[PDB]
Amino acid sequence: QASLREGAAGELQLAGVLDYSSGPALREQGGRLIRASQAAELVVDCSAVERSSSVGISLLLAFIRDARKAGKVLSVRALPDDMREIAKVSSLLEILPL
Amino acid sequence: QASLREGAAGELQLAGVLDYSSGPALREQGGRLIRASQAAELVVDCSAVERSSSVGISLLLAFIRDARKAGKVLSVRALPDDMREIAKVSSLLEILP
Amino acid sequence: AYAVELKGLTFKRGSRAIFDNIDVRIPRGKVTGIMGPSGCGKTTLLRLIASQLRPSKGEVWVNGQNLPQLSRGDLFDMRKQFGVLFQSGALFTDLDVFENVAFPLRVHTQLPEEMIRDIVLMKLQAVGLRGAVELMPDELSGGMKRRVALARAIALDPQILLYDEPFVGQPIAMGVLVRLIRLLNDALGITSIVVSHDLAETASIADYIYIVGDGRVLGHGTPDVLKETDDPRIRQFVKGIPDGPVPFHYPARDYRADLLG
Amino acid sequence: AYAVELKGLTFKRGSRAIFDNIDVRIPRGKVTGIMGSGCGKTTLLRLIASQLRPSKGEVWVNGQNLPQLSRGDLFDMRKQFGVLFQSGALFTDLDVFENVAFPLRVHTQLPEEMIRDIVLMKLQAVGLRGAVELMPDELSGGMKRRVALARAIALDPQILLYDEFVGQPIAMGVLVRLIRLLNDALGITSIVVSHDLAETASIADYIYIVGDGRVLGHGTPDVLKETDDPRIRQFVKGIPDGPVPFHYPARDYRADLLG
Amino acid sequence: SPLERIRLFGRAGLDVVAALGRSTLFLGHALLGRRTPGTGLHLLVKQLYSVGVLSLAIIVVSGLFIGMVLALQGYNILISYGSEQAVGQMVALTLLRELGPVVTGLLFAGRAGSALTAEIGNMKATEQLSSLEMIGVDPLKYIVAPRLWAGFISMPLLAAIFSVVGIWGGAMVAVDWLGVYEGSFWANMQNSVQFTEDVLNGVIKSIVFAFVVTWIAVYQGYDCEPTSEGISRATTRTVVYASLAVLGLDFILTALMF
Amino acid sequence: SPLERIRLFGRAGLDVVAALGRSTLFLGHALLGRRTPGTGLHLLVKQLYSVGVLSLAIIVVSGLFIGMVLALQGYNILISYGSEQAVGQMVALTLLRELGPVVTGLLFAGRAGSALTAEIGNMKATEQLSSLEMIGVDPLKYIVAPRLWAGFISMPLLAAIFSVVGIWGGAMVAVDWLGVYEGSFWANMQNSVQFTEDVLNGVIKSIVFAFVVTWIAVYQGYDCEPTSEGISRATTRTVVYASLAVLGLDFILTALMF
């Protein structure tokens, strides 16, 4: 499905599809595994995210409740089309730091 | 309320109000009492019928089921304006003569 | 001059104050339409002007004298003046369609069972449900179950008649009903009070439309003068406009911290 | 190209033949509306949702057909559509939060904090975010439908059908705005199935008419407005009398009234 | 919170008594209020059909079964003691002086106590009742009054039929199946019944049940909330209450007469 | 016409069989069909508290009442035959092999047989069930399956509680009210119970009718017609049918073990 990589210096790298299936794996390998090593100024860019559902939105939203917990601030970049469509709904616009 | 009179030569004469109350009395004094004596060419004119409800329409309808039963033919004349609006909503307007 | 008037009308239902000092003035001979938001007492306001529910304080002047200040033997005698068409018909299940329509007759009137049949038959014709003088109210479709109830209402020839949710679940069925509620008005010269939240067809047949909200009448008028009254609540009701005085969103905490915390 | 297609579709309920060789073609990404009581439009919904097995014929939904799939794959397909049934059809024993979360806890095993985010952002989209606390009977009629619309849009289906806006203006307005926003924003196929012709045509883009077992034509709301089909011109307008009889089959206004 | 739970419990406790008094006022206005124009004996006959005559197959089949249970059981326990002829007396005594009316109150609270609240609560949800007051007929006298009358004068009759069929079925299983001496059944039966303490006792115990069953079954429906679920909760409250109003009141009626 | 009435009768006849087979297929698909994703033991617990724990006050109060009735009655019948200290075994024989489970099946068909048909039948009218298959959860396994398991494993438990409270209440009225010798009650009771023919007998008799009581109570709701009146007719059919299938099935079960 998709993968997560390129941590410890922000610049979090996201792969293709974020659906209901690839959700928990991406969260687990990103939440504690990746976001604990991170230092600061965290940027995640959904450049190579070609298809996504609201599970992806909640993934990016689950990426913020721990960076905020870990103090260091994060922002999202390269918001893909479909993700924006679901983010152009309720509490996913100005809430999402981009 | 109202009364019925002037039978035995058609020309049935109707009085003022035909409502739910004055219904059965008018029918009884007209149905068997009056319409049995009648001969033919029965005309009833609601000239002095100033207020009426659907009850009155049923009354005029209660006047045809027996003249037809008694063979002799009847027709209605000088129908009240209030009855006409009630008659218009129903499909019985053509039925009335 | 006015069929129904609500002089200082207010209603309590368990210390809830469904109404507080409302004043509606129903003009006779005209199709007036009251409405408002779902749960504003639209159906409850009907049981007041029909005296099925006793008001808290205030009087309802209906066709002259007021209802809550009459003897029961005279309140019943007044009941002949209005009939009610509820949504879903409110048809007596144990009675067939004929006896259903005849029921208001056999109550206030002792007419010959042959004369009563003619009155029931002409009514059932006026609504088109004449052929089904045979069936039981569950053997009738949902659309026709309401027309026979309307025929039951127009029996005894009331001078005013109230329609609660007259055109809820329709399109051809809704058309015949919206035509009948107007024909019965212009032909019989009877006051019609169409009380439905369906605004389009209401305004279509209404001549003096009201709006009831949170216990008080939120203005009133002819359908066009009510179309642009600039009252934020009434301009929000008369149009779609999902957000306005009535909140689109529910009372909750900031969404930003909602999923954050 | 087409989300749902009914190739030679017909349905029999107790040897009554509800449908007989109908062929509807639902275009994806567009709000299509199949308005019609007898037409049993609500029963048709089940067919294109495979809640009811057709008599003979296949329903091509988002590619493969439904009645010719394994149960372990039919369930896997169920993720593609949600249903916004009239009156909410809300699970009474579950609160609003678990109500909206129910489609998630079924097809998905997500962390109970991630399910909460989707339920929270899904309930806020319909405006019913504050009532994440209540029970479906503690909710007003119109508000209850909004939570159901949120339960449906959970899992992000690609098509969604809302059988019966009805019996409610300000509420109906938010609902008719949401069924269009969810379509243009999410790019999901909407199948609005209501008798209220006005608002249907308002949001519909390719509206159908189903009558006495057969699809009685179809088209864009204006091309269907004056199709000159007596039944369809009688449906699309008020016109109390037409092909569908205004009067019941009586005997005679002269005989029955006098005899 | 605990302070919330106790407030809710006290509210329910006072609400119960409020309903217990509202029910009494309702029964008063129904039974002896006035004489509305739409009334008659045709209503009482139509009700007596739906309440008693429709509830006839259930209680008859049940009485047959409970009789051929009582006999098929007491024969087994009395053979051990050595008393065998008297199974006709023991089977009749339990059914006529107690279990007869009690089981009839349990089946009449279930069939005609649920099909009564459901019929008069759907009459409330579909505005069938509200459309009566606006016609001018007091629904308490036109709808509730015959239903209450149908219950008062049908449940004792159904209990008598229940006891008769139960006795006869107990005979038909003792005599024809278990082979006890035929005539002794009815003989030992009728010498030790003591009409004034078994027949009239059970009949008064059944009348008392009918008044308390057909009134909490006709009120539960009249005071339901007008919705498809309020009716379905009232038609369960009226089975629970009318089973507790059968058993409990039978304990209070049998303390009065053992 | 007669030819019409007999055709309608035969149609109703064959339809009653059609429904009796459809109910068997429904019970099959519910109990051992598959394992849908939404299932678990939380459903069985949530349904165990609504089918049994909610039905606890009704059957406990009723068991107390029926026990103080059976004792207050048999004492009066036993006072003439000298078997005075034999009233204990009576409230534990006439309440533990035939009347305990039977009255528990009558109150469980009424409360949790009518509150389980108007709850599983109102879910079908509001499309709560149809909105489950379109989610992908088989409602027969998510809704019907737990209710079937919370009826099977609660009505025998409720019958045991019923018998216990009835025995204890019979003691509390024999001993404390009627003044029979205290210890003799339980002594004469336990020497002549014969567990394998009283306790296990009544328990199997309660499992049998109790299983039937929650099968024809969860099916009548599932196969009602989706309307506020179809539900109210199904919640009455399920009391009638589950009272017949309690009584008659108790006859069939007592004819095997007296």
Ligand SMILES: CCCCCCCCCCCCCCCC(=O)OC[C@H](COP(=O)(O)O)OC(=O)CCCCCCCCCCCCCCC
């Ligand atoms: C021979 C004398 C004549 C006998 C006359 C009969 C007496 C009538 C009694 C009336 C009963 C009340 C009906 C209420 C109406 C209603 O609908 O009542 C409904 C309301 C409930 O209101 P809700 O709608 O809010 O739930 O009240 C009830 O729930 C009533 C339940 C009745 C239970 C009866 C129990 C009585 C037995 C007591 C025995 C205690 C002994 C304890 C010793 C240990």
Ligand SMILES: CCCCCCCCCCCCCCCC(=O)OC[C@H](COP(=O)(O)O)OC(=O)CCCCCCCCCCCCCCC
């Ligand atoms: C060769 C095939 C013959 C067909 C056999 C079918 C027989 C089973 C059905 C019985 C007839 C039911 C008619 C319905 C009546 C009606 O009007 O219909 C009324 C109701 C249902 O209709 P309502 O909608 O009016 O409630 O029907 C019933 O009450 C159903 C009856 C259930 C009984 C079936 C199970 C009984 C098992 C015992 C059998 C053993 C017999 C013992 C004696 C020796």
Ligand SMILES: CCCCCCCCCCCCCCCC(=O)OC[C@H](COP(=O)(O)O)OC(=O)CCCCCCCCCCCCCCC
């Ligand atoms: C001296 C007083 C007389 C004693 C008996 C009076 C009769 C009425 C009281 C019986 C209980 C009514 C409950 C009705 C069932 C119901 O609501 O149906 C079951 C309900 C379910 O609630 P829902 O409305 O949410 O479904 O359970 C409850 O919440 C009821 C709570 C009441 C608990 C009290 C009773 C428990 C034990 C009874 C007393 C013990 C006897 C021993 C004392 C010596």
Ligand SMILES: CCCCCCCCCCCCCCCC(=O)OC[C@H](COP(=O)(O)O)OC(=O)CCCCCCCCCCCCCCC
């Ligand atoms: C000499 C006379 C003796 C005759 C005795 C006859 C006894 C017959 C038994 C009565 C049972 C009646 C059932 C009523 C159901 C009904 O009407 O059935 C009718 C209904 C449906 O009817 P509708 O068409 O009205 O909905 O059936 C159902 O909804 C499902 C019920 C099925 C359950 C049937 C019971 C079978 C029990 C088998 C288990 C036994 C286990 C024992 C192992 C040791």
Ligand SMILES: [Mg+2]
């Ligand atoms: Mg209303």
Ligand SMILES: [Mg+2]
């Ligand atoms: Mg439908």
